[PDB]
Amino acid sequence: GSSGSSGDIQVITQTGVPGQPLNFKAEPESETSILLSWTPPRSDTIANYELVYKDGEHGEEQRITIEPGTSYRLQGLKPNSLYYFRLAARSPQGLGASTAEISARTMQSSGPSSG
Question: Fibronectin type-III domain: which residues?
Fold first, then answer.
C-alpha cells in the first residue's frame, strides 16, 4: 500500500577474495556428462571452485568440490534434461564472486529399441 521499509541487508565488505573467472561456458560433452570451460583470474592461489547446480528450476542448489584449474568434467546426469550451473572461485580466506547463471542441455539419448 504505502508503508514502506526498504531495508536491505548490510553486505559485509571483506577485501581479500578472488575475482570471478572469465570466458565461462558450459557444453554438453555427453548425455550424462557435461564439460565446463572457464578462465582463472590472476590470483594463482586457488583452493577450488564452487559449482552450484540444480535440477531445472525446481532443483536443489548442490555444490561440488572442483579442482583449482581451468576446466572440469562433470558426470552423473540425466539425458535430455536441463541443469543450471554456476561457477565461483573459492579461496582459503573467503568466497569470491559467482559467474553468470548458465545452463546446458544434455544430449538427446535414443530410445531403447525393443526388438
Answer: 20-109
109 with 30: CB under 8 angstroms?
Answer: no
What does the alpha-carbon distance between residue 46 and residue 91 come to, in Å, rounded to a whole number? 6
Q: Which of 42, 55, 53 is nearest to 89 (CA)?
A: 42
CATH number of 11-115: 2.60.40.10
Q: Where are the domains of the chain?
A: 11-115
- Alpha carbon distance 58, 86 (integer Å): 16
- For residue 59, which amino acid is it? G
Q: Are strands 65-66 and 102-105 parallel, antiparallel or unpaired?
A: unpaired
Cell digits for 51? Answer: 559449482
Query: At a CB cut-off of 8 Å and minimum separation 6, what does 81 contact?
Result: 55, 56, 105, 106
